[PDB]
Amino acid sequence: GWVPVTKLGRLVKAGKITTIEEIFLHSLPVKEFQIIDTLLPGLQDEVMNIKPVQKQTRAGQRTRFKAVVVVGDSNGHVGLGIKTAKEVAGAIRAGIIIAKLSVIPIRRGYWGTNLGQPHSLATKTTGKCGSVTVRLIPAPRGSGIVASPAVKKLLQLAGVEDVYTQSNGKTRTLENTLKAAFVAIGNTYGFLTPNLWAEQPLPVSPLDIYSDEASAQ
Template sequence: MNIKNSNFPLREKLILVKRVSKTVKGGRVFSFTALTVVGDQNGKIGFGYKKAKEVPLAISKSIEKAKKNLFNINLYKNTIPHKVIGNHLCSKVIIIPSYNETGIISGKSMKYIFEVVGIKNISSKLYGSSNPINVVIATINALKNIKNLKLIYKKKK
């Protein structure tokens, strides 16, 4: 599905802005990194992480990268169809579906991801490192592991 043909406008969330430095012969050179998540609240999501000399430029670069890396997730009634686990470096994320009106029970970084993807009822648990970059990548890896319900039912028969 093309982004331009989508009926839902893309929603952008800024998760993290950090000042980083590089030590050179003349002293320190400062720049900024930005981590953003983009989604259409209907199962499409992407994330971007970019660096620039100024904050607005870093944010716009990361949003553009997130828009280029969009992919679809199979949702089921405002949640996910089954439990999934995602890893990245020292961060481990377990995402469990909730079928009643429980809301989003998770940490800040994961909450932003679930909001832009369109998940309204879910609970999650984070083990290991709580670094926002690792948490976002681990959550994206977990969401990529979601299987379609039709394929699950075919395998059971």
């Protein structure tokens, strides 16, 4: 087991919060890579890309490697992170660490009809890493994921079944394309539909419910 150093890590390792949706709901800054490990077992990571980058020394050059990883399951918790390091598998490794500290909720949805376990997004959404806009459209069922294979993987682990996409910008810059689509799904829950017009009490923030077992021992 891990050795929680943060106030959230307690409530996690203790067993007092069993779902991330609580950590999300109250906007809780998960600082510990092991936190999301527990909450989400079997969270699948795929390495998207590995490429070297070059600085200069006091004369010649510098070589190291950038790693692009996406972590999601199938159910709408996704993360994306980019780490660059000396070794390769060390960049991949620490890449998945940052990839998990990024994981994010997803508001899924139907197309025209609410029968049977939403297959698509809620609304249309878009997000832009500089110059690159990726835009998501609510396809119907059986349509599949219409998008470039680089994003289709992200939307798979995003738990998207059927979707439509439109992209404007430099698409061959990959690290900006995934970050663009990552802003996209990572929006839908910020898009306020009439479903969510419903008034809510402000649930009580377990940070102070478990305040006993929380604070430093």
